[PDB]
From Swiss-Prot:
Motif (PDZ-binding): 167-169
Job description of the protein: Receptor tyrosine kinase which binds promiscuously GPI-anchored ephrin-A family ligands residing on adjacent cells, leading to contact-dependent bidirectional signaling into neighboring cells. The signaling pathway downstream of the receptor is referred to as forward signaling while the signaling pathway downstream of the ephrin ligand is referred to as reverse signaling.
Every SAM domain range: 94-158
Family to which the UniProt record says this protein belongs: Belongs to the protein kinase superfamily. Tyr protein kinase family. Ephrin receptor subfamily.
Modified residues (Phosphotyrosine): Y111
Compartment(s) of residence: Membrane
UniProt organism field: Mus musculus
Assembly and interaction partners: Heterotetramer upon binding of the ligand. The heterotetramer is composed of an ephrin dimer and a receptor dimer. Oligomerization is probably required to induce biological responses. Interacts (via SAM domain) with ANKS1A (via SAM domain).
Protein name according to UniProt: Ephrin type-A receptor 6
Positions spanned in the full protein: 957 to 1035 of 1035
Length: 169
């Protein structure tokens, strides 16, 4: 586009908007560090307890607020992209052509070497990974683990759908 793009808030600015900024360091230090990757499949009550949000009313408030954030479709890569789209004008869902490009789409590129060192370089390998499997290759921060597993789930849904349609199996 020729015109400007509006930028997303920081986690701190978002928390201030909902009266919960005292939890900023706990979120950031545990990988809840980008407002594009917070909310229902990603942020869970038990995780909030574990990182030290002991106040149950604040946990409920935070979880509801995270659910109110827009779901931002992942950006394609600057190199090659593979997209699924429903309808002539529907949203493009990227499927990626490399593990690195997939990780970059969720700002998790720092973990490419972790996946490579484990030999987890194909979709088929990665698609069945649990949170525990992800932690075990060295993704320690809970907010990053949750982000990755949520992304895997949505990518797997799209890939299964395509397979079920019966042409690219």
């Amino acid at each position: 586009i020729s015109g400007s793009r509006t930028l997303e808030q920081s986690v701190g600015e978002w928390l201030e908007s909902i009266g919960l900024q005292q939890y900023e360091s706990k979120l950031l230090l545990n990988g809840f560090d980008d407002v594009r990757f917070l909310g229902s499949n990603v942020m869970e009550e038990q995780d909030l307890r574990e990182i030290g949000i002991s106040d149950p009313q604040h946990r409920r408030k935070l979880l509801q607020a995270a659910r109110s954030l827009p779901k931002v479709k992942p950006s394609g890569s600057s190199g090659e992209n593979l997209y699924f789209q429903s309808g002539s004008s529907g949203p493009e869902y990227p499927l990626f052509v490399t593990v690195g490009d997939w990780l970059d789409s969720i700002k998790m590129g720092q973990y490419k070497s972790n996946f490579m060192a484990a030999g987890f370089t194909t979709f088929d390998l990665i698609s069945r990974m649990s949170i525990d499997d992800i932690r075990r290759i060295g993704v320690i921060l809970i907010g990053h683990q949750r982000r990755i597993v949520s992304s895997i789930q949505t990518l797997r849904l799209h890939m299964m759908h395509i397979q079920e349609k019966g042409f690219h199996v």
